[PDB]
Amino acid sequence: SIAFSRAVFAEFLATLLFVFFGLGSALNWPQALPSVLQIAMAFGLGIGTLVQALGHISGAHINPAVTVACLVGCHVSVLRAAFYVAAQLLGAVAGAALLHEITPADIRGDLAVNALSNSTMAGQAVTVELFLTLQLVLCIFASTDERRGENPGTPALSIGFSVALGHLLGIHYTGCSMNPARSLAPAVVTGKFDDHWVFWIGPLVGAILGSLLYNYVLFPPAKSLSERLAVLK
Amino acid sequence: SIAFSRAVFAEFLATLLFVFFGLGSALNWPQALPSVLQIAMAFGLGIGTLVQALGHISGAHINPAVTVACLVGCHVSVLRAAFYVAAQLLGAVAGAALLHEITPADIRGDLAVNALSNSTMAGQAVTVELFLTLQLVLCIFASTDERRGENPGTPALSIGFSVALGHLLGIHYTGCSMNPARSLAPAVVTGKFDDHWVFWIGPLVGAILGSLLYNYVLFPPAKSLSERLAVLKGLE
Amino acid sequence: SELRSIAFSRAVFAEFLATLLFVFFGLGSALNWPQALPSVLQIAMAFGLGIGTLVQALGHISGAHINPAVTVACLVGCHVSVLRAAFYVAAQLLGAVAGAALLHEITPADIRGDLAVNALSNSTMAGQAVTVELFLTLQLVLCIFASTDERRGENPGTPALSIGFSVALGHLLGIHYTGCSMNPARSLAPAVVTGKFDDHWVFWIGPLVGAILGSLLYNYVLFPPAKSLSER
Amino acid sequence: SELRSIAFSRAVFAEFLATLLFVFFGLGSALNWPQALPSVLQIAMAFGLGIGTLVQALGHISGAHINPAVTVACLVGCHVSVLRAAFYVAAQLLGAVAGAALLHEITPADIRGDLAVNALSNSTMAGQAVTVELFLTLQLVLCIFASTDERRGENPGTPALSIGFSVALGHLLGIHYTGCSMNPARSLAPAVVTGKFDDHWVFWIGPLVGAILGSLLYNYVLFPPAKSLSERLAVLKGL
């Protein structure tokens, strides 16, 4: 019961640092405007560092979509999945509120809210978010699959660069979500809920798609006791 | 029976995600035009992520040139190589068609077709694409070599940054192909086939050079007794 | 023992040489070169790959702290005698100012300029900045303590690259506020060479409080040692 | 003998092919200005990922020096015969000039220019420039010696990346002073092709001294090997 509290707190602290570092590096800084690779690096190295620092404590989800995909695949109780999602949403809004407090009001602006950029249709954008989170969920599962042992090699760096890979594409359409907590945090702080359903349906459908594709299509487990039914039939 | 189907599907899904993410990060230029390092990071981390995600399922080729290269030193049969190349070409055009659907019409443009750039001639260009794939195939063979001298596992990031390394050079000449499927996908969707042979002869010839250079010149692998007999009894 | 004595001397020398190379490469890549002004990602990569290279090169000799803050974090965290920590902090401050003095005499005088002294940027207040420096160093010691935790021996992991990209991560954000310190030696080095001590206490209070916060958070809240025989 | 063995011939050819690919990719990515001018981070990444990829591709075959300074560094440390060191340096110089001549052939004449020769930049003096090149190669040699240290546990691929990012680290600083050499073969290759030899001694004295300095510092001062079979057992001592 005490290790579960450490894990929920770690998920809270991790999403706090992720959103604080991520949005603050994505703000419109006048003299030095951030580039797409610069923002992708910020979010990328953010997940990779927090997975390194807190992966052994809680699994380092830092993402409700990852937690939901973990609910379909790995052995996580619906009790733990709810506590994780709740901890991530609370940590995210705390990191965005903290960033707002420390960032001068001149630079804050939209506080890096997710908005449909490059005149992307919501139906077009929700399809992008689907495949953005799909490749991340595929990489997270493969990097943390216990059946692979120590063979993955670079779990923290690979998951980070997978997040950066999605940002290198998703920034132009929606500013890249791949995380419902990363989208909700600046939307609550600064009043901006432009097409917010895209940043929830997209990642969640993309996450459950990658979990089902991996755990039961690409690399399913061996048949369990259910084979006794085919013998009886 | 099923494991081969899961591998071919992985090659299809991997090339689908690779082309979707790769070409998309090369278009999408409103007020923020992508730089050479930015585009190279997209293709680089794309291969590295998909080698990490699907390498243990299919081998993570995501390249008909790489699949052709593995025909000599990857224990891949001519049956599997054809199924892999077909899955790569189908996934590539599916990723380019999907990107076209989700990208607004004004931004699409060329859809990141491989094209001759900076007044580079097709003979000069096909020479670049050879060495772009030579170093990639050279890195893949060592990264998947049991005698490379490290703990078991495949370095997906090393393979990814090898793809990125080729882009920091190849973009200025051809937009960097290194992958015949990566070139056919936007060529089929858009219709632009200008000097399309450069993006096929280049990667395929560069791959067979790296495979022959590694497996016969640089680091010839250890032959099993059954493999050793196919040589001897095939002689005289 | 005689073998134990040199190993400590090898470690103190490595800490001096490491902070010397870190400050020399970091500041020199952050200078305002007119033909190619460095971008935030360019500067972040310079400091990031600098730590990662030096941790790769000297981690197995001294631990590759390269930061008085993380050395203090090991005092409260990875329990190390105050003797070794004092020798480490002194070597870092001496190597840093030596690296900044070397870069000064190595770079033409016109372009030396501010020598990448940590300074308040974008009208950020000292109270807001000292809060940023806290969380920049907080995540760094969180990554360092996990990458070097005695209990994670088995698989070697990627400590040098992870810590290096953790330093870069802090620069993606910290550059816009203070030019990113995360290291009191990296701040004292160019301030001593080129007299610029504007709000220097921020670059000392910030990293030290964030380091002790992350060391206390790791060793007592997140991943403490087993109190009893329940799991040892 | 060592000369008449296949592994030595395979190692010399690997050193030749590796330097050929490194110079071809490095200069060409640093020299292609027309409408897209390469950035310092871009050039640093090209040379960085270049060394990292070739160390990963050919390190197990020859050691992947790709640098007469690095070869000299192991001549002062890593058991490399003075016969092997001469064959390695000769293979690197031949592969470099072959890679530079190859790049000149495939790059259109409008963009070739000086072919990315190492040149003193931003009014840096030769004494100041030769001091940069020393410390650029020193940290690289320190990183190479540690990335190849059998006493250090690492995961696959990360040592090649660490060496690569060490090269990229030097370029993030060295480009502003000299265009970043850290390799006498990388400087001679375009100098022979294009014919520009301005202050060529800086790109030779600097990297070599920095390599010997780094090899001596690592093998004798920082992390020397054991002397007796009881050394490691003695380090334990009491509890």
Distance CA B15, CA A107 (A): 40
Distance CA B199, CA B126 (A): 7
Task: With beta carbons less than 8 A apart as the criterion, state whether B43 and A47 touch.
Answer: no
HSE-CB of B53 using CA atoms within 13 angstroms: 31
Distance of CA B72 to the CA centre of its chain: 16
Residues in chain B: 236
Distance CA C220, CA C145 (A): 12
A35 in reach of chain D (CB within 8 A): no
| Out of C31, C156, C164, closest to residue D153 by CB | C156
**CA–CA min distance A190, chain D (Å):** 34
Instruction: Give chain B positions within 8 Å (CB) of A150.
Output: 151-153
Instruction: Give chain B positions within 8 Å (CB) of D14.
Output: 218
> What sign for the dihedral angle of Cα B121, B122, B126, B132?
positive
- A–C CB contacts, 8 A cutoff, strictly below: 117
Cβ burial, residue B155 (10 Å; 0-12/13-18/19+): buried
Distance of CA B217 to the CA centre of its chain: 23
Look at the block and give the residue holding tokens 């940043």: A199
Give the residue among B216, B182, B232 at the shortest CA–CA distance from B21: B182
**CA–CA min distance B140, chain D (Å):** 7
Q: Which of residues 125-164 of D touch A (CB under 8 A)?
A: 155-158
Give the residue among D48, D49, D95 at the shortest CA–CA distance from D71: D95
Residue B231 vs residues B68, B226, C178, C182: alpha-carbon distances, Å: 21, 9, 67, 62
The secondary element (H helix, E strand) that includes residue A1 is none
Task: With beta carbons less than 8 A apart as the criterion, state whether C194 and C117 touch.
Answer: yes
Cβ neighbour number for residue D160 with a 10 Å cutoff: 29
Structure tokens at B218: 């640089």
C166 in reach of chain A (CB within 8 A): yes
Structure tokens at C163: 């810590």
- What's C224's DSSP letter? P
Q: To 10 degrees, the CA torsion angle through D95, D101, D104, D105? A: -110
User: Which amino acid is residue D69, in one-letter code?
Assistant: A
Q: What share of chain B is helix, strand, coil (3-state, %, to 5)?
A: 70, 0, 30
The nearest alpha carbon in chain A to C149 belongs to: A53
Which chains share 3+ C-beta pairs under 8 angstroms with B? A, D
- What's B134's DSSP letter? H
C16 in reach of chain A (CB within 8 A): no
Structure tokens at C195: 């007299």
B174 in reach of chain D (CB within 8 A): no
- What's B27's DSSP letter? S
Task: With beta carbons less than 8 A apart as the criterion, state whether B159 and B47 touch.
Answer: yes
Instruction: Give chain D positions within 8 Å (CB) of A160.
Output: none
Structure tokens at C14: 């490595």
Task: With beta carbons less than 8 A apart as the criterion, state whether C206 and C69 touch.
Answer: no
Instruction: Give chain B positions within 8 Å (CB) of D12.
Output: none
Look at A9 and C146 and tell me if their CB atoms are within 8 Å.
no
Distance CA B75, CA B64 (A): 16
Q: Give ∠ CA A232-B2-B3 in degrees, rounded to 5.
A: 130
Q: Which of residues 65-104 of D touch C (CB under 8 A)?
A: none
Distance CA A114, CA A133 (A): 15
Structure tokens at C29: 């890549």
- Probe site for chain B from A131, A174, A176 (most B CB atoms < 10 A): A131
**CA–CA min distance D239, chain A (Å):** 29
Distance CA A31, CA A45 (A): 23
Resolution (A): 3.2
The nearest alpha carbon in chain D to B35 belongs to: D36
The nearest alpha carbon in chain B to A126 belongs to: B102
Solved with: X-ray
Distance CA D237, CA A192 (A): 64
Give the residue among A98, A91, A68 at the shortest CA–CA distance from A181: A91
Task: With beta carbons less than 8 A apart as the criterion, state whether B195 and B116 touch.
Answer: yes
